[PDB]
Design a protein around this ligand. Sequence first.
Ligand SMILES: CC(C)c1nc(CN(C)C(=O)N[C@H](C(=O)N[C@H](CC[C@H](Cc2ccccc2)NC(=O)OCc2cnco2)Cc2ccccc2)C(C)C)cs1
Ligand code: HEM
Length: 459
Amino acid sequence: THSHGLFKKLGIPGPTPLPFLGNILSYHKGFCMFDMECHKKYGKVWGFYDGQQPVLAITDPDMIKTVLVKECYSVFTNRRPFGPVGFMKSAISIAEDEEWKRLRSLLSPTFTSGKLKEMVPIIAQYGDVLVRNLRREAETGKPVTLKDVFGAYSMDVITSTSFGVNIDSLNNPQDPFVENTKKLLRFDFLDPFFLSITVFPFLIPILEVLNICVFPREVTNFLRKSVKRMKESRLEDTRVDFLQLMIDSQNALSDLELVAQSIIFIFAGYETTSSVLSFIMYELATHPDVQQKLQEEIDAVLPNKAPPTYDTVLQMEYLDMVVNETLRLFPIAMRLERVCKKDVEINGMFIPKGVVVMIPSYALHRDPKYWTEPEKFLPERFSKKNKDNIDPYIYTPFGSGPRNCIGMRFALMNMKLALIRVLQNFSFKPCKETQIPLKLSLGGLLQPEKPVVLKVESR
Ligand SMILES: CC(C)c1nc(CN(C)C(=O)N[C@H](C(=O)N[C@H](CC[C@H](Cc2ccccc2)NC(=O)OCc2cnco2)Cc2ccccc2)C(C)C)cs1
Ligand code: HEM
């Protein structure tokens, strides 16, 4: 269909596009499989079409550094525009160019060491509720869905840190704040919707006029007035945080622009954290040796079940290696993307304006070139002895350069506080409903298709 001659013309290899669809039918196997096959078939560089949209996949470490780091401001500043967003247009992750730059420098000081350290005792209050929730399900000896119990912890941790609003979500099985959230991405290729906007962009500006959204008007009004509430709470009182840093600005940030960042952070800080924690626990169970070695490290650094501190969290090398290794196998972003905003040639390759450049993270994390036994879970690959044999541009679970994950440092620590507490009280065993091996969901988000269910024993 016209734009379909580009990679032919550039002499770049790729699967042959269909009219209108592009290579969209190959997503039927899920696109991590697609990416992996493209790598195997085509080598270090290839091209494909998301409908009419050209996407150039790259895998050269240098070229990746060029686009992620060296030419971020100048050419590769923005992600793809995905679908109809409405007011979320203003969200840092979706914001383009100048708008993004000022939101970045406005919101970045949120995750500094001092500000992290001030959230340590705050989580220290929820870490303790989490253990209390598990200890009860461990009594019954009856299987646990980790997503459920982790999810609630994450929600408590995010709402309270970013805003200063303790909302008891852990002492609340029935809770409006977790439920309204998780129904924020219906993202599937079986879901006829995202398959029509992934393929079919020309729809987008119409939907913007229709005020149709990927987030049902349902969530963003609960989340609207709810944020519109903690806002006044702060405004009406006589600790300088996320919700506050934006009340620095509101004396040049506005209202829906505040709500928008809140929602991003509420989302990221709930779904990602709980998912990875699920993945990690699946790994510790299917690998007891590793589970025990980590329980040893914790008891070593934090003797007599000692409560975590910021610095002791960092002391724990093996914890970090476990966290890193899970993130190798399960990068929740499966690909990184930047839209090429002007003609360019990087490392001896021409790239035309408008192309989406894509880093296939999930694929590179499993590449036989860089990783021996790339399917095996092996934390030792992240030991100080082997740590630098590892290319920071092949291993990118957090992205890289200026548009990398603003929430990385908080995420690592948030996750690590949860683990420490959890493993210093319980051990995790494979039961019957456990899926071995675990398989991934084909649709959008890198998820387990069956939830992660394990047996929990006290110590
Ligand atoms: C075929 C094409 C359309 C696609 N490409 C992909 C791969 N990909 C980059 C995605 O993950 N999907 C994209 C997507 O939703 N990503 C987002 C777009 C913004 C959305 C906004 C949003 C999400 C949920 C509820 C409400 C709002 N996501 C978002 O901001 O994620 C927060 C996060 C930070 N760190 C981890 O997670 C950008 C992003 C990507 C990876 C990591 C972090 C942020 C879209 C292109 C659909 C899936 S479909
Ligand atoms: C373990 C959980 C998490 C993982 C694996 C993760 C991974 C990522 C990745 C890979 C990106 C894209 C970076 C790039 O494209 O180069 C990203 C972007 C981002 N993440 Fe994180 N993330 C996690 C948790 C968080 C948390 C807790 C927050 C903050 C609440 C967060 C906020 C963001 C924002 C705002 C962006 C867009 C950055 C920008 O455009 O300036 N994510 N996340």
